[PDB]
Design a protein around this ligand. Structure first.
Ligand code: SAM
Ligand code: SF4
Ligand code: MG
Ligand code: MG
Ligand code: MG
Ligand code: MG
Ligand code: MG
Ligand code: MG
Lengths: 164, 126, 398
RNA sequence: GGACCUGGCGGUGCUUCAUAUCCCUCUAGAGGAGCCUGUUCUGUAAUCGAUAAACCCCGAUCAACCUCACCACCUCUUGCUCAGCCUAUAUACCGCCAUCUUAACCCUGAUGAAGGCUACAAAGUACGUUAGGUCAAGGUGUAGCCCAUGAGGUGGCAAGAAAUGGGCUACAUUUUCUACCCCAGAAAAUUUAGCAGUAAACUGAGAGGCUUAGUUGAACAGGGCCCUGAAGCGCGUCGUCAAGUCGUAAAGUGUACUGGAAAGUGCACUU
């Protein structure tokens, strides 16, 4: 599976129109090797449905697609990265489903089919969440999702979905 | 050696470059052929070539420097500069031999003017 | 000796002789005069608008002559061998006289502009002829991926676009010179620092990727290996490129003894596989211009080059059409398609009354100087030779 | 473990000016018409290809029923003369052009690595290279075919179309013709130079498109750079999974809390 090369920081500065390197207000993991490590630690993703948050440049996206996922739902807030993610989707047809919106309000409960819903007491329902978000957004997100587990709703309508 | 590691006595005639021929050096051969109106320049050139080859093969390792070939009327003077390594008897033999061969080969009174030197007169080192 | 009088006959497959004239015989690979895309020429002139005076003509001429007459770097063993003889017969001065002083060219901004102005059109023509070889002989090939080692101004990228733009989707351009990368980007963007690229999917890198996992459909190196400072660097680069080559490896150099020697070294290196257990086990053969894999019969004292006529970019000094003389070798993965491989005409064909001179590199590994005439060889083969030209294939069998 | 030293970045940017070539400005001319050439497409079995080899007998010239070249059919044979071809090769040499390369001494630091300047002066002095072009004002060889790469005969071949590149002619009223050599009468967009006796216009002499001698004689003449020159300041002194057959170019120190933590806030300190 041949995919486009990862964008270097030069192309990223050009893409965000900053024209310099000290004005990003953001840190990117542009090391496909550490992202390989993270996706390995997420478990066995073969034919899994991955809800990936905070896609960004797409190191995590490339790592996950390298694993034989079935559907990879991407939720990006910025529109300057949608072009790169569309190129990624075209390079790997049928696997990358990109969406625009906030992860704090996006409704994952309708995203995937209802044939994946396992019971709560059974094994985790083959649906995974992977996320490299800004730390200013991951804490409210985990509080919200902890409430969802307490109520057995939201991303956990499919069962005991695992998060990384 | 090594690639960036890279980055002989000579007499007067050898030292000075061709663009000094009328500035510092002279002309070895002197004749009227190349003057304006005169003829047979090519014949004189061919004669000069033969003289130089013959002399360099008849005095091997003796000529310290290049010949000077002068021509006045039908006379043909070879002024050569030789070393003091060969015996004078052999020099006299070769002078007589060369004079007679060149006189009968060019149908003119050729004459030869050895000047011996102790060793090559080195001008500089290049 | 692939032309025995009265024995060798034209190779009639697909019913060639019956359905189509001789001027279109399948070995005709000659390309019409090459014109650069208008976008490329306009970008070049726009980028050179800053300074295109009488100095630039002299600079272009000097750079062109320097590159054409440049030799391969002198290996240290060669210095030792020559120094031994010079001592046997001061020695350093004699070496300085009798050895070529090979220098690295540092392509800063000014030299990048001069190199563009001096070589863009020539490189485009040479690479276009090399690519037309593949296109003509394998029209089914639809590459999706191209890499260009030493992509100076993007001439390979533009030629590959002009030929396979309906399928190519990624152009990796490797060039350690930041000024040259900047110039290539400006050229792709219409000669303006800000704009929209004409070719989509071009990626620029300053370091050569070294990984056999990532493998390209076409890997090109045009006038790039002559800039490497040593045979060890050339060997490692060629090994890396062959490892990353998926279908075709196109090497192009100047049509000189130095370029031909460099290319034949690369050809031997690729053909004599040394890797014990490579990731890609497919063997390699010579798709063009060689009809064999045996040693070149012209590496002894001559060279082997091919000419492509082209129209230079209009400038204050470019008025008449020019000719680009280049050496090439295309190495393809797999095995030869069939056993009917045809002689290559490696020199201008001389047409004279009722006979034709062709210098052929035969499949058996030998050169043959053939004087083809109708009565001796056959009317059809004589007409095929009459219409053929330099760098074409002669369809002869048995 | 402590102290110190050399450094090296084949480095990175900027600053000011000398900044001439090169710019930019500025000045003066160079697109239409008719033919001839370059490229492309289309078309033919084929060449709208050439005249030490036609024609013409103003210049030039197109196809000429010249002749060579191409295409389709044939013929000749020991013949021209131990025949005949300009067919190749300078990718044979020579020649002619062109390309590229071409140490010692003396002091200082306690006699350590190490260092050595002040002018109203404080240790410093001494040829090769090339698958190059040229077989027309030139040679020395080598190869080819010899029922044909030789000699003839019968027909055909004589292209079409565009866009652009180039060349030759005439292109006027500040002109043209006569007399005169200047007071008469009749007619009707890129590019090339600039920089002065230059551009432009007009005459003569030569060797037989090239070399020399003259006459008349302009317009513009301001700003800034690339690049060496002259110096100055600063900066700067990469990462990762198993090493590359890896990727790439006001500020601080503590402590406490931190659930909108790519670090923030609170309290106390330092320069
Ligand atoms: C001058 S370009 C040759 C012309 C160019 N290929 C074209 O198509 O016109 C060759 C470039 O290769 C670069 N180069 C040399 N070694 C390299 C390497 N090992 N990796 C990447 N680039 C290299 C040099 O900097 C040089 O600029
Ligand atoms: S085509 Fe023949 S002469 Fe040319 S490089 Fe190949 S083997 Fe050598
Ligand atoms: Mg001829
Ligand atoms: Mg004709
Ligand atoms: Mg003839
Ligand atoms: Mg030659
Ligand atoms: Mg807080
Ligand atoms: Mg604090």
């Amino acid at each position: 599976c041949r995919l486009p090369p990862l964008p270097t920081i030069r192309e990223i500065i050009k893409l965000l129109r900053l024209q310099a390197a000290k004005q990003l207000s953001q840190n990117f993991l542009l090391d496909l090797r550490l992202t390989d490590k993270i996706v390995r630690k997420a478990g066995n993703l073969t034919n899994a449905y991955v809800y990936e948050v905070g896609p960004g440049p797409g190191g995590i996206t490339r790592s996950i697609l390298n694993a034989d996922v079935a559907e990879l739902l991407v939720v990006e807030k910025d529109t300057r990265f949608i072009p790169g993610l569309q190129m990624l989707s075209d390079a790997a047809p049928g696997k990358l489903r990109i969406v625009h919106g906030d992860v704090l309000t996006f409704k994952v409960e309708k995203a995937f089919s209802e044939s994946l819903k396992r019971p709560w007491e059974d094994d985790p329902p083959n649906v995974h969440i992977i996320g490299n978000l800004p730390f200013s957004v991951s804490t409210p997100l985990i509080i919200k999702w902890l409430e969802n587990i307490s109520c057995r709703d939201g991303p956990f309508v499919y069962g005991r979905t695992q998060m990384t | 050696r090594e690639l960036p590691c890279a980055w002989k006595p000579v007499t007067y005639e050898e030292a000075h470059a061709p663009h000094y021929i009328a500035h510092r050096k002279g002309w070895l051969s002197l004749h009227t052929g190349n003057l304006d109106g005169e003829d047979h320049a090519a014949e004189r050139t061919v004669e000069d070539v033969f003289l130089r080859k013959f002399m360099w093969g008849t005095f091997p390792g003796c000529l310290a420097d290049q010949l000077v070939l002068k021509r006045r009327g039908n006379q043909l003077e070879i002024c050569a500069v030789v070393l003091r390594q060969l015996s004078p008897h052999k020099y006299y033999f070769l002078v007589g031999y060369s004079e007679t061969l060149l006189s009968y080969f060019y149908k003119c009174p050729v004459r030869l003017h050895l000047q011996t030197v102790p060793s090559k007169v080195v001008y500089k080192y290049l | 000796a692939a032309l025995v009088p009265g024995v060798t006959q034209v190779d009639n497959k697909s019913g060639f002789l019956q359905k189509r004239p001789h001027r279109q015989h399948p070995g005709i690979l000659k390309l019409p005069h090459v014109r650069l895309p208008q976008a490329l020429a306009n970008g070049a002139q726009l980028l050179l608008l800053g300074s295109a005076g009488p100095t630039m003509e002299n600079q272009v001429q000097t750079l062109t002559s320097y590159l054409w007459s440049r030799h391969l770097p002198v290996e240290p063993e060669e210095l030792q061998r020559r120094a031994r003889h010079l001592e046997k017969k001061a020695v350093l001065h004699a070496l300085r006289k009798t050895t070529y002083h090979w220098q690295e060219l540092s392509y800063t901004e000014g030299l990048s502009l001069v190199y563009m102005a001096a070589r863009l059109d020539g490189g485009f023509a040479a690479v276009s002829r090399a690519f037309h070889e593949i296109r003509a002989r394998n029209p089914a090939f639809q590459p999706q991926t191209l890499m260009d080692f030493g992509s100076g101004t993007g001439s390979v990228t533009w030629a590959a676009h002009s030929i396979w733009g309906q399928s190519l989707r990624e152009y990796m351009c490797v060039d350690r010179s930041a000024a040259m990368l900047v110039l290539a980007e400006k050229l792709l963007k219409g000669g303006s620092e800000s704009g929209e690229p004409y070719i989509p999917g071009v990626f620029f890198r300053q370091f050569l990727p070294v990984s056999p996992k990532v493998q390209f459909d076409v890997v090109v190196s045009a006038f790039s290996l002559s800039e490497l400072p040593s045979k060890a660097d050339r060997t490692e680069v060629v090994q890396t490129l062959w490892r990353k080559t998926g279908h075709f490896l196109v090497l192009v150099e100047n049509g000189t003894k130095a370029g031909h020697s460099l290319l034949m070294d690369a050809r031997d290196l690729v053909l004599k596989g040394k890797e014990k257990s490579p990731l890609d086990p497919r063997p390699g053969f010579v798709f063009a211009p060689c009809p064999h894999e045996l040693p070149c019969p012209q590496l002894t004292n001559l060279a082997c080059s091919f000419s492509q006529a082209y129209h230079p970019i209009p400038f204050s000094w470019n008025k008449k059409p020019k000719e680009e003389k280049f050496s090439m070798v295309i190495l393809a993965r797999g095995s030869p398609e069939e056993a009917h491989r045809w002689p290559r005409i490696t020199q201008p064909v001389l047409k004279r009354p009722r006979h034709v001179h062709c210098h052929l590199c035969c499949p058996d590994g030998h050169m043959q100087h053939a004087v083809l005439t109708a009565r001796r060889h056959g009317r059809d083969l004589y007409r095929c030779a009459r219409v053929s030209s330099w760098g074409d294939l002669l369809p002869v069998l048995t």
